[PDB]
């Protein structure tokens with residue numbers, strides 16, 4: 001099957017269902033952006049993210065200076081209708097590449113099922129939505145109807161190559177750390193990709209290599225779906241917990257620290273840097289969060305809104321958290337099923353495992369050094385496909401990851417900025 005049924009053109013007419021101008025809730029004030037609902041609970045906004053953060057409203061560089069050498073600034077990127085057409089087609093292409101594998105089909109199903117928890121009530125007997133987990137669609141009559149959604153694919157802000165997850169917070173709840181979840185905004189662009197070196201000693205060295213191979217953007221997107229996956233199930237490790245990298249003397253020299261959440265998202269040998277004592281403290285911590293989600297679903301006897309039933313919403317949240325619906329009318333947690341789902345989101349959905357499915361050359365660790373960033377156009381099938389990416393089959397590019405070879409497949413890549421030396 002396809003993940004995206006409709007092949008969207010950016011200049012397609014607005015219908016108010018899956019092609020419409022929309023407003024982001026807690027983005028202070030904004031003018032409407034044309035958005036595309038490519039799947040149930042998944043929208044794509046082909047715009048530079050001048051919205052989610054009040055501090056990121058411009059696309060120019062600030063007084064900021066000698067802090068980020070791994071950065072790239074172009075205020076004209078993603079400003080024309082043609083770029084927006086290729087952006088949304090590039091995101092759509094990468095989403096089918098992720099859907100093309102069993103691992104991606106499982107992560108995408110886990111993402112679509114991960115409805116953010118209805119925990120905005122202040123009465124225990126009432127199940128109410130959290131109002132910033134929605135969007136405001138303009139419908140054909142001209143008015144605004146709010147609609148729940150899980151995932152948003154947004155363009156980057158001023159710093160083009162700094163992809164990251166974003167989500168609005170509560171005044172009290174920590175939505176990505178309390179099992180609730182929250183609508184995730186992924187700053188992403190399919191028009192750029194990073195370089196990396198094939199030898200480990202070179203890739204982890206901040207002084208060697210120009211970036212001979214390029215990262216498959218399908219891996220980069222899937223990396224971010226994994227973060228949003230944990231964040232949509234409220235099991236994200238607090239970004240204050242970081243690991244003091246003592247396996248890279250260049251890292252030790254600068255005191256560079258790497259978060260537990262990203263080491264987990266990459267997986268491989270990196271996810272073993274979490275020593276088993278705090279790995280178990282997290283599972284026990286989030287086990288309790290799942291259970292008073294079950295206790296809250298037990299306390300509730302009324303439902304706010306008119307969109308759906310109380311019966312339907314309780315079934316949604318014992319489907320998301322895999323709670324046990326016995327016949328006491330009360331919901332429970334099965335530690336075995338909780339571990340089955342907690343391990344799936346954390347260990348099964350990793351950047352390293354997606355590499356095994358794509359049969360793709362990739363960075364062997366997250367504790368490396370970015371080397372270069374290229375300009376790419378993966379829209380034309382002569383350049384990139386759903387099933388192969390850059391290594392087109394029955395062609396000199398299919399062998400030896402030659403499609404990702406920026407020197408052998410040189411017309412698919414144009415280097416824009418070197419990161420070697422600036423470290």
Ligand SMILES: *SCCCNC(=O)C[C@@H](CC(=O)NO)c1ccc(Cl)cc1Cl
Pocket residue numbers: 070161162163164165186194195196215219220223224225227228262363370
């Ligand atoms: S959902 C959070 C995504 C986090 N982003 C990253 O970890 C780094 C990304 C791109 C970025 O934001 N800044 O460089 C990245 C960079 C290089 C490579 Cl080879 C892969 C990836 Cl995923």
